Amino acid sequence: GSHMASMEIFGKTFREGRFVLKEKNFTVEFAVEKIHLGWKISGRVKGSPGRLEVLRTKAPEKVLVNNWQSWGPCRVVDAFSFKPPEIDPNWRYTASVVPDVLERNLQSDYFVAEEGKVYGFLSSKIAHPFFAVEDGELVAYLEYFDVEFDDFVPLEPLVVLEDPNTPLLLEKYAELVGMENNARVPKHTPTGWCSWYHYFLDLTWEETLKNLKLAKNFPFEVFQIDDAYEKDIGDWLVTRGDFPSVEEMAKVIAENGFIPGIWTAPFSVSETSDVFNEHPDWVVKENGEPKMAYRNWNKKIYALDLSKDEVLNWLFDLFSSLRKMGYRYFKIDFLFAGAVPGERKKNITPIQAFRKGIETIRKAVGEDSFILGCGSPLLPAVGCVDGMRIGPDTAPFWGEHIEDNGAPAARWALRNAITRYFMHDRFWLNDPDCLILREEKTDLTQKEKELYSYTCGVLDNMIIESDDLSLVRDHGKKVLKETLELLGGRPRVQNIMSEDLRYEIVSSGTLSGNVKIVVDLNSREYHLEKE
Numbered sequence: 001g002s003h004m005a006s007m008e009i010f011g012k013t014f015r016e017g018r019f020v021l022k023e024k025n026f027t028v029e030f031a032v033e034k035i036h037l038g039w040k041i042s043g044r045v046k047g048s049p050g051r052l053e054v055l056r057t058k059a060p061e062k063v064l065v066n067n068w069q070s071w072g073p074c075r076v077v078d079a080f081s082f083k084p085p086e087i088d089p090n091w092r093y094t095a096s097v098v099p100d101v102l103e104r105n106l107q108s109d110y111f112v113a114e115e116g117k118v119y120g121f122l123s124s125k126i127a128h129p130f131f132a133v134e135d136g137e138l139v140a141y142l143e144y145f146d147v148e149f150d151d152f153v154p155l156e157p158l159v160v161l162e163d164p165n166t167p168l169l170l171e172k173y174a175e176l177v178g179m180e181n182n183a184r185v186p187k188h189t190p191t192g193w194c195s196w197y198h199y200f201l202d203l204t205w206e207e208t209l210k211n212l213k214l215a216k217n218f219p220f221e222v223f224q225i226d227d228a229y230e231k232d233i234g235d236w237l238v239t240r241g242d243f244p245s246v247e248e249m250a251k252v253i254a255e256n257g258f259i260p261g262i263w264t265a266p267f268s269v270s271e272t273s274d275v276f277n278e279h280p281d282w283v284v285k286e287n288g289e290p291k292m293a294y295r296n297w298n299k300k301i302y303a304l305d306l307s308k309d310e311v312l313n314w315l316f317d318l319f320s321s322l323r324k325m326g327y328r329y330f331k332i333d334f335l336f337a338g339a340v341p342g343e344r345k346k347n348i349t350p351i352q353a354f355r356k357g358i359e360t361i362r363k364a365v366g367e368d369s370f371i372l373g374c375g376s377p378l379l380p381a382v383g384c385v386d387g388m389r390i391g392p393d394t395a396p397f398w399g400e401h402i403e404d405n406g407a408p409a410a411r412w413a414l415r416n417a418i419t420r421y422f423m424h425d426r427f428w429l430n431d432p433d434c435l436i437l438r439e440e441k442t443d444l445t446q447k448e449k450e451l452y453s454y455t456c457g458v459l460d461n462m463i464i465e466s467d468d469l470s471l472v473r474d475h476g477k478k479v480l481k482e483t484l485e486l487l488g489g490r491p492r493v494q495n496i497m498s499e500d501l502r503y504e505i506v507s508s509g510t511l512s513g514n515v516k517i518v519v520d521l522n523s524r525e526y527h528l529e530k531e
């Protein structure tokens, strides 16, 4: 095709074959090979590749772009009329791991799509793979963060797929990612309860116990304590308020017949924490001093340096201790912190460091524990997590005055469940964030609760409820029951390039047979048909 002859690969005219590029500072050896639905570019690199240009082609007008982490948008953008965002200096790295790009040009992490075409990297093991629109050209890069390689390391493979069925392409892409990374796709999806979206930081053990008793009347397997119990970020085995010990909490939850679950932010240590105050050289640095990874909880939060053996040992000991207590469901959050650019003890990439950290956690919790990632780089976590939050936080409100900028809102949480649907049952189980089904202490309507819940069910996504269970009555019980009956299928979002927040979603082979739901996030309406 005329468009394919127009591509450049490592600066050379596109064509099938086997090539060597010897530059001043680096060497690439790569192959361009035909695969089903398109092409694969793979090989190996050594030296100092820096920010390595892999592919160049003319930019499409409308592109599906993807943020690197859980909370960031996956959405269709007009590439021509793009203006750089103002990046919040307290959250710079959720917006981009290469913020020099985003402050100038449109950025997409891991993959980008247009009608009929997907460009997608199959892994992020060493480099960060991304796309930029640079003076009207789409450019694919592998970022090596100034790391030098004495011997060859593998490229992250790039595929270029074409077919009129864009959803089929994204599904194919994700199947290839799953194979490249030995994705975990559990045969069972947990149900359960989470404290966060009712109680927030104000959870008490008294209220937890009330819910633990009521949970016996609900179809919940896991009972997960969120952020509230811990005295500080990093001090995960020290509790506060009316909480008992972390070990005692697990025992109470297990005595009551649930799988105990717990939230941590394990790559994060606050400026006030015992662990940071004891171990000031355990963190990622800038000009030799602690580098803020983000600000949250009204504190500067630092990133653990996952290149250091002392740090990995501490993480192993923490998670193995939690396993010994009986926790078997782990929500591990703010994981981007582990992958911040900066100075580390070993001269490895932030992505290499990140992967050492999450692999340590998996080793510690064992094969029989469920790991839910959150706030996380997506591609580097494939093969390690069982489930992954794939959108910004939901909320007990639709979010009429909330922009698509990452503040909590049911409407934007649900958008990302739809636009990242194709990762589900291929990368991991997708977590669309919790259902909020209470009928007091909420501004959600019955129709909004139904729209969110039934969409998650058609998508076969994880179903976790987050409510004061005393405030969930006949409607909320009915909605959860019906939602669980929509699970089990193979979903497809038929019109993935939609720009008006209306989506047509089918799922084959659910517990309710073949189903279709049309959802309109702007009118807050749905139309569900079950065969």
Ligand SMILES: OCC1=C[C@H](O)[C@H](O)[C@@H](O)[C@H]1O
Binding pocket: 196, 226, 227, 263, 333, 374, 375, 389, 393
């Ligand atoms: O601090 C608790 C918390 C923070 C993040 O915004 C998560 O996505 C949210 O679900 C909650 O665990």
Ligand SMILES: [Mg+2]
Binding pocket: 243, 244, 245
């Ligand atoms: Mg005690």
Ligand SMILES: [Mg+2]
Binding pocket: 388, 389, 390, 391, 392, 413, 431, 432, 433
């Ligand atoms: Mg989510």
Ligand SMILES: [Mg+2]
Binding pocket: 425, 460, 488, 489
């Ligand atoms: Mg499934």
